[PDB]
Design a protein around this nucleic acid. Sequence first.
DNA 1: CGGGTTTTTGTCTGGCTTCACACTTGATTTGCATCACTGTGTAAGACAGGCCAGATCCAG
Length: 32
Amino acid sequence: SYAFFVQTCREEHKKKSVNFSEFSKKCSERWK
DNA sequence: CGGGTTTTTGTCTGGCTTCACACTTGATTTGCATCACTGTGTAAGACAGGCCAGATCCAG
């Protein structure tokens, strides 16, 4: 379940995918 | 009988290696079965039997 919501958010903010470094601090304000 | 606080880990995430993987055929190299033999078995003791010797007995 920890990956489903992340994949949905990835589709979300990717429909608007090679930058994993600047994505580190994105999930901090999502699961909270 | 189960609340705190670090360990112990598989991932999420997508993008970079170094090895993995279809075909030949003619060798070339290993692996394994087969066959006629080998050594270690290895010195004394028990018992019957013929043979004289000498003791055991016989009779004038």
